[PDB]
Amino acid sequence: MIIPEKNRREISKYLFQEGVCFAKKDYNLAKHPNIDVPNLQVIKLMQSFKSKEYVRETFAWMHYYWYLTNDGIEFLRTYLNLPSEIVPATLK
Amino acid sequence: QMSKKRKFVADGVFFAELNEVLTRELAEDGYSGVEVRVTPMRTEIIIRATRTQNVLGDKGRRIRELTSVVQKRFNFDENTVELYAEKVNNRGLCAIAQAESLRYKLLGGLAVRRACYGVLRFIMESGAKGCEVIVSGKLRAQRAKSMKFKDGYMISSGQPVKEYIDSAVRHVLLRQGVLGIKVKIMLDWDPKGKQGPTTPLPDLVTIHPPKEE
Amino acid sequence: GRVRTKTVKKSSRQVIERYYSKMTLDFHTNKKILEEVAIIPSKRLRNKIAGFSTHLMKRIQKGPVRGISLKLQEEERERRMD
Amino acid sequence: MIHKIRITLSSKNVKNLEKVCADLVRGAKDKRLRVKGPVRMPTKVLNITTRKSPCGEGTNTWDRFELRVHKRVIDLFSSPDVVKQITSITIEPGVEVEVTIAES
Amino acid sequence: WNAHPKNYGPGSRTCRVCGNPHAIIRKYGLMCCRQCFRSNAKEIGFIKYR
RNA sequence: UUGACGGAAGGGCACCACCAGGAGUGGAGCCUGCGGCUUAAUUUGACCAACACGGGGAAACUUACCAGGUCCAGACAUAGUAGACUGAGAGCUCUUUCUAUGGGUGGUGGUGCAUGGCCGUUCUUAGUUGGUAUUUGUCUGGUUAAUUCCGUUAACGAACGAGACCUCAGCCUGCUAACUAGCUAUGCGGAGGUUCCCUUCGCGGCCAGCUUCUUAGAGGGACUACGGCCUUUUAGGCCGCGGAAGUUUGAGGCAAUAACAGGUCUGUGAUGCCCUUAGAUGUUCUGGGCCGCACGCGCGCUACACUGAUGUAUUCAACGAGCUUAUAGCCUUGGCCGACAGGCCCGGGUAAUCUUUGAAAUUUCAUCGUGAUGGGGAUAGAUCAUUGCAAUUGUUGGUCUUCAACGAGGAAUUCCUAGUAAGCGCGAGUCAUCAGCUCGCGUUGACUACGUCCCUGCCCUUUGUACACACC
RNA sequence: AGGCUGAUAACCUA
Ligand SMILES: *[C@@H]1O[C@H](CO)[C@@H](O)[C@H](O)[C@H]1O
Ligand SMILES: [K+]
Ligand SMILES: [K+]
Ligand SMILES: [K+]
Ligand SMILES: [K+]
Ligand SMILES: [K+]
Ligand SMILES: [K+]
Ligand SMILES: [K+]
Ligand SMILES: [K+]
Ligand SMILES: [Mg+2]
Ligand SMILES: [Mg+2]
Ligand SMILES: [Mg+2]
Ligand SMILES: [Mg+2]
Ligand SMILES: [Mg+2]
Ligand SMILES: [Mg+2]
Ligand SMILES: [Mg+2]
Ligand SMILES: [Mg+2]
Ligand SMILES: [Mg+2]
Ligand SMILES: [Mg+2]
Ligand SMILES: [Mg+2]
Ligand SMILES: [Mg+2]
Ligand SMILES: [Mg+2]
Ligand SMILES: [Mg+2]
Ligand SMILES: [Mg+2]
Ligand SMILES: [Mg+2]
Ligand SMILES: [Mg+2]
Ligand SMILES: [Mg+2]
Ligand SMILES: [Mg+2]
Ligand SMILES: [Mg+2]
Ligand SMILES: [Mg+2]
Ligand SMILES: [Mg+2]
Ligand SMILES: [Mg+2]
Ligand SMILES: [Mg+2]
Ligand SMILES: [Mg+2]
Ligand SMILES: [Zn+2]
């Protein structure tokens, strides 16, 4: 899945900014309701995180629910290059 | 603005979908139900679970994740919806909790006969009028069969079933296929309305003892 | 058919056993008594019990019945024989 | 000074709806406000009839599902602030309260 | 890719619970297939009286 | 010994049995489902308890089938290094600026004889089971819709089913109370008749009054209560007054034990194993097919006319459903344009508020006149409009024309006991468009019976049995 | 060819 580096940052930025994300299982959807990135690229990128245990996945009624994990926060900070004192919105 | 017919249906669909999302997210935390208390300026969601310490997480981390994802998914205004965990007062009278309790025993490896009697014995000790556990599927042989564990009082027909019977159905995904768990608990008449229904059984007639004064 | 079940017959006998003094030969008065001296969940069940008990009160007037134990009536019989 | 304020209550549970209506009428009779209602609109019976079988085999049996909506309308002749005080009381679950200034 | 119009017809609508396109109940905006609705009817608030 | 079975017996029972009947179906045309045939494909499941069933009314999508073109929507881990064509420039060059290995994932792929769940059926009957081989309890008899009860009694005392129960309908001039429901009175106004008065219609009044009519909460009401007779002191039954109601008042919902290799893997991010996974059974795009027509069958629709068709006049329902407001996506009033179909404009309604001032059969007058006729409307030509990206293999709706069988249906066979059958239309589901279907609703409104075990079955007892895969 | 039967034979109809 070749996600543009600009779109990849937006997903990681949003995911790190808020420790949760969701998506409708609709690959045709043009834009994610919370991110400019296309809906498909959100679903596939967080599939990569699910395989590396950076997120925890739930599915129900045609919707994905992803939750950041401790390792995911560790990874995203290095990728986004942010101060170690910043944490997702769910940890405050 | 939408008509009353669609608004009530939309409220029912939100409750049904929220329960399913929590039924899977909190499967191994004793999730037993939810109550949606919509009020002005705030909608309160009360999560019932036998083990609340695992639903809240460390310092309430998990309950905040559930609140955040629920608010975004269901188009709620930020800081306008709250989730509160709560404990089931009598875990042995909740069929949904016993069905999930039986589920994890079977997954762990406990024998079906022993696991089903542990639930059946626990429910009757908790003050139930009766209980019935049914397990169906490929137990040991290739061909499927049903085992029924029954104890005490039980009813099947009529209106009272809706008030006096607490039933749940769950699927156990074992290595040879799927087992079906059915827990059916008959409650006892509780005038206070907490342990069981306050209305008595239709055919139960009580004669007051006469007084000698 | 109009056969009364065990629920109606059993309850009626119990009422007449311990409230025979209160009961009367009138259906309308008897069904107001059942509200006072018993907890009958439904109105239809209360009417059938009141109607059958009123039937049993008429039975007792003519003589003794099988399943009803009236102590004061029993004492009268014992004095008669003795 | 005095305005006709309309309060609309909707619910699936009759007992809860009737309980809240009595609490509002009785809560307004304490302030000696003129009260019109409660007016009970005809019950809306949503109905879904569906095949019981998940497949098409067997006798064609049907489930008739009904979701009843009960609606009450109460008119209070008073100022908005006073009405806001009466309705501010905690309402029973599932009863939807809606306060509007009657257009008359 | 996905160019064909999907503004009307069965292909546009799917079950909100399971995603299946068949036997959708559109009345009152339920948007559930008939099988999923029967399973979730009690939770939604629908009841059998007669 | 238990079951099952019997062209064994006894008792009882059911319009998915019959009797007495009504409407029919089976015959015609057509609609739709199934088989067969044909086909590139005409995807497929199912054979009382399959066959207008899979909510399966498929133009695309649906879609599983057929002819072709794309795309990766192959996580994670390890090691390695403007032209030609075409249905369409879809892809491929030009120009401008990944590959193995494992391990996954998807699949309406297979197996419902590996499964869960759900549903159907045995089975609409009254049946089933503990405690103290199997049996008793759980019964000779009476009684009941009922293993319902009265009694009998080596059983006693209990658990389920039945009943109770819950929903709708039927009574309330009594309660609560209504500018989103009305009535009565009054005031003003219009019209008619004789200024008052009378008849009728319109409008107004949160200070006319009120709740009969409407709505919906709470209650009441039937218990066979009362009378006669029959039954054992019983349980109960028949008839009758009164009563809204005297079949458990009517109709439903729920509904035991034990089962079936019943249906569904094509409802499901229910699911085991198996198959396939980039010249894919994944996915998407274009086109075709699912509808293809010597024939057999099932559910139906329309008919064969005068108890009618046609043309007038006239006139009364109930259940229900409805929008993103973008110029406007839903239900649509009113005005205008048009023969119709339909179009334009101003609007109402997220609804007891607006559509809704809301049907048909029927009633009424006239024409037709026993002639396949003005019965019937299949088949077919021409043409117009609407839905849609797209209408051809006619989507549907109009106009004129065309004007088939069919004259009441063989053997056989279905449903039904009262606001029922039948007739009559309406809403809802499906739905951009499409109803001969289904689920409900009201309108008109009967014949016959109040039985029986003859046929088809069912329950209980006795009895026979070489059957137990249980008389297939 | 149809009907009768769960199905075949027999039987009945066209
Ligand atoms: C689980 O426990 C809750 C306690 O409130 C009860 O309401 C549910 O019925 C039961 O299944
Ligand atoms: K016929
Ligand atoms: K069918
Ligand atoms: K099954
Ligand atoms: K006048
Ligand atoms: K299934
Ligand atoms: K499978
Ligand atoms: K479906
Ligand atoms: K024609
Ligand atoms: Mg019971
Ligand atoms: Mg019952
Ligand atoms: Mg009969
Ligand atoms: Mg028959
Ligand atoms: Mg006959
Ligand atoms: Mg006919
Ligand atoms: Mg034929
Ligand atoms: Mg025919
Ligand atoms: Mg049958
Ligand atoms: Mg197609
Ligand atoms: Mg296609
Ligand atoms: Mg495919
Ligand atoms: Mg699948
Ligand atoms: Mg099977
Ligand atoms: Mg009234
Ligand atoms: Mg009442
Ligand atoms: Mg049964
Ligand atoms: Mg099979
Ligand atoms: Mg077809
Ligand atoms: Mg049919
Ligand atoms: Mg004609
Ligand atoms: Mg009318
Ligand atoms: Mg002619
Ligand atoms: Mg079509
Ligand atoms: Mg259909
Ligand atoms: Zn579904």
TrEMBL record, chain A:
Q: Name one GO molecular function term.
A: structural constituent of ribosome
Keyword Cytoplasm in record: yes
Subcellular location as annotated: Cytoplasm
User: Where in this chain does the record put each Plectin/eS10 N-terminal domain?
Assistant: 3-92
Classify the main location. Answer: cytoplasm
Keyword list (alphabetical) reads: Cytoplasm, Ribonucleoprotein, Ribosomal protein
- Give the CC-aspect GO terms: cytosolic small ribosomal subunit
Q: Which family does it belong to?
A: Belongs to the eukaryotic ribosomal protein eS10 family.
Q: Please identify the protein, giving its name as recorded.
A: Plectin/eS10 N-terminal domain-containing protein
| Species for this entry | Solanum lycopersicum (Tomato)
Its organism's taxonomic lineage begins at: Eukaryota, Viridiplantae, Streptophyta, Embryophyta, Tracheophyta
**Gene of origin?**
LOC101253268
Automatic annotation (TrEMBL), chain B:
Per the record, the domain of life is Eukaryota
Q: Under the cellular component aspect of Gene Ontology, which terms does the record hold?
A: cytosolic small ribosomal subunit; nucleus
Checking SUPFAM superfamilies in the record gives: Prokaryotic type KH domain (KH-domain type II), Ribosomal protein S3 C-terminal domain
Gene3D superfamilies linked: 3.30.300.20, Ribosomal protein S3, C-terminal domain (3.30.1140.32)
**CDD domains named among the record's database cross-references:** KH-II_40S_S3
- Keyword entries, A-Z: Ribonucleoprotein, Ribosomal protein, RNA-binding
Tell whether Nucleotidyltransferase is among the UniProt keywords: no
The Gene Ontology biological process terms listed for this entry are: translation
GO MF terms listed in the record are: RNA binding; structural constituent of ribosome
Specify the KH type-2 domain's residue ranges: 18-89
InterPro entries recorded for this chain? KH_dom-like_a/b, KH_dom_type_2, KH_sf_prok-type, Ribosomal_S3_C_sf, Ribosomal_uS3, Ribosomal_uS3_C, Ribosomal_uS3_CS, Ribosomal_uS3_euk/arc
Tell me its family.
Belongs to the universal ribosomal protein uS3 family.
UniProt-recorded name of the protein: KH type-2 domain-containing protein
Protein's organism = Solanum lycopersicum (Tomato)
Report which gene this protein is encoded by.
LOC101257282
UniProtKB/TrEMBL annotation, chain D:
Q: Which UniProt keywords apply?
A: Ribonucleoprotein, Ribosomal protein
GO MF entries = RNA binding; structural constituent of ribosome
* Keyword DNA repair included in the entry's annotation: no
Give yes or no: UniProt keyword Ribosomal protein.
yes
Task: Tell me which residues make up the Small ribosomal subunit protein uS10 domain.
Answer: 6-100
Q: Name one GO biological process term.
A: translation
Q: Which GO terms describe its cellular component?
A: cytosolic small ribosomal subunit
- Name the family the entry cites: Belongs to the universal ribosomal protein uS10 family.
What is the recorded name of this protein?
A: Small ribosomal subunit protein uS10 domain-containing protein
| Natural source organism | Solanum lycopersicum (Tomato)
Q: What range of the intact protein is shown?
A: 20 to 123 of 123
UniProtKB/TrEMBL annotation, chain E:
What cellular component terms from Gene Ontology apply here? cytosolic small ribosomal subunit
Molecular function, one GO term? structural constituent of ribosome
Q: Output the GO biological process annotations, alphabetical, semicolon-separated.
A: cytoplasmic translation
- Which Gene3D superfamilies does the entry mention? 30s Ribosomal Protein S14, Chain N (4.10.830.10)
Q: Name one Pfam family in it.
A: Ribosomal_S14
> Where in the sequence is the signal peptide annotated?
none
Highest taxon of the lineage:
Eukaryota
Tell me the keywords, alphabetical order.
Answer: Ribonucleoprotein, Ribosomal protein
Q: Which NCBIfam families match?
A: PRK05766.1
**Entry's family note:** Belongs to the universal ribosomal protein uS14 family.
**What protein am I looking at?**
40S ribosomal protein S29
- Organism of this sequence: Nicotiana sylvestris
Gene behind the chain: LOC104212316
